[PDB]
Symmetry: D2
């Protein structure tokens, strides 16, 4: 697929499983229009978000619902979510998660 | 001050100087209202954004203009910006340091939260 | 395999390809004995380092030759290498690379 | 001072206090010779490790005892330690800040290098 999301748990040394992910595309309004969503799998991956035809050049945002994930683990987190915003010009967006920290990386091949 | 932003360049091993930072607070109607803004200094720090009085409980967004920083250095980076969104002061007033470490295709953000 | 190494390039948004990796096992001497090595593939992965039988409990070190990688790219780096040292009690050791920074993460499933 | 170490806890969003740090320098015979040591403070900083005179050109190793820090907090972490290995001062004297951000199954290290 044109776009993949991968999430990791730095506390537990594991894939971050069942994490909600929402993808938005910026409308001509300058508002975000919902585009695709899903939850990460047991391998911490989310696949099948979009297709090559659909995934045109644009400014896209991916919101990962980190706070819900931490809440289910009974660990109190800092962020509301982790947002990745990029201009789409294969994208793997990877996120590594900690309660008071996250990093996000793009692997574009 | 209650909120501080610090930015680092992971490519040069330096502070990230002259980076724009825009801060927003979630309104009653769920909109993001402009709250404060500034540029990082020679040390890559931004101080004086707000005050103990002004910085009330709320959901806040700190948006760091990473793209402009990379572009001025000749790089076309992946991200539009780095944005940090968090609930502040709901246990009482705290001091927040929002740190960001920048790479062209990656960034990390960390919060150091302390009690006056 | 029991042990996998994965390397990413934060400057280029890509797998870190052809990066030298050496694995050591701590001897009763308190010295490191060479154990396995390889170079990362076009996908930035290094597989087939060891086998379950061979990979007994121990304290292991994985040295990733980051400086050579940066040198080939004509970007001057800070570290001599990135070293990961752990007690082995499936391990994926992932490294994300920048010239003056790296992070390493373990995913243990 | 020429070399400073700073450590942060990515789980609690605080400085990592009372963390042991051991510094080594590569000898002529290729062995690692003990060079300096200390513990991080309340701010998670370690200052005063060395001096402009002492801190000559060389390959240096900074080993941060992450395992003991996690264990005292009840966590069994992945890493034995975080170790940073670098060539120092070969362009002339510099000031080095070695920063580490800690998680139980992950860590990152960054260097901020500046010119007196
Ligand atoms: O892309 C990936 C990635 O980034 C990480 C990772 C490494 C360091 C980080 O800081 C964050 C994530 O693990 C991965 C593991 C995979 O099997 C595949 C990947 O593509 C990634
Ligand atoms: O100098 C600092 C620094 O380099 C970092 C840092 C940022 C991102 C990381 O991933 C790791 C460390 O945090 C800091 C946090 C502070 O409150 C004060 C600092 O001076 C630093």
């Amino acid at each position: 697929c044109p776009l993949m999301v991968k999430v990791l748990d730095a506390v537990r040394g594991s894939p971050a499983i069942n994490v909600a992910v929402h993808v938005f595309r910026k409308a001509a309004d300058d508002t975000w229009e919902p585009f695709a969503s899903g939850k990460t799998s047991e391998s911490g991956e989310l696949h099948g978000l979009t297709t090559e035809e659909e995934f045109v050049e644009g400014i896209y945002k991916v919101e990962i619902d980190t706070k819900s994930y931490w809440k289910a683990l009974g660990i109190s987190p800092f962020h509301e979510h982790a947002e990745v915003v990029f201009t789409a010009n294969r994208y793997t967006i990877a996120a590594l998660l900690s309660p008071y920290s996250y990093s996000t990386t793009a692997v574009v091949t």
